[PDB]
Assembly symmetry: none
Homo-oligomer: 104 residues x 2
């Protein structure tokens, strides 16, 4: 009867209400994750700039470390060189004077 | 004697909402899913940048130490180069005088 219409409409008004509360529920979830995603992308755009700057500094600083290391080697050698010269002087001085006990 | 018309209109407007809502909601679910996904992918990226960056800062702090240890060792060597240059000149002078002491022996 007129009953089928009321029953087919009881059914529909029910679905529309389910779906309406669900579309509501899911909209809230999305609105939420959309905030998180914004907070995050920023915190990350941030870290990127720090990480990058950090690596850049470390790039031209490797040069400085190399150069300081070599400057210290260039001296460790200048010194060793002076020592071989002094070690020779003495071999020579010492000799250059035995050659005057002959010819006293 | 028509009641079909009493409902035909109110009914087609419900069965239409049901279809709209269904579509509307299905689309909000894709976005919401995408978000969950994007967030997770961002977080993994975050850890990876923090990691990389802490590695660059640690490495550069070690290099700072290195450079500071070379400086103190350079000043040292520069002195020991001076001292050795003086010891050579002195060594020489002493010897020249010592062979000049052996000149009176003629």
């Amino acid at each position: 009867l007129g009953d089928l219409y009321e029953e087919e409409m009881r059914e529909l008004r029910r679905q529309v209400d389910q779906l309406t509360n669900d579309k509501a529920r899911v909209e809230v979830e999305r609105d939420n994750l959309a905030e998180d995603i914004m907070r995050l992308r920023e915190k990350l755009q941030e870290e990127m700039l720090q990480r990058e700057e950090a690596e850049n500094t470390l790039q031209s600083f490797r040069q400085d470390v190399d150069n300081a290391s070599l400057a210290r080697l260039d001296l460790e050698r200048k010194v060793e060189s002076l020592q071989e010269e002094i070690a020779f002087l003495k071999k020579l001085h010492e000799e250059e004077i035995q050659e005057l006990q002959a010819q006293i």
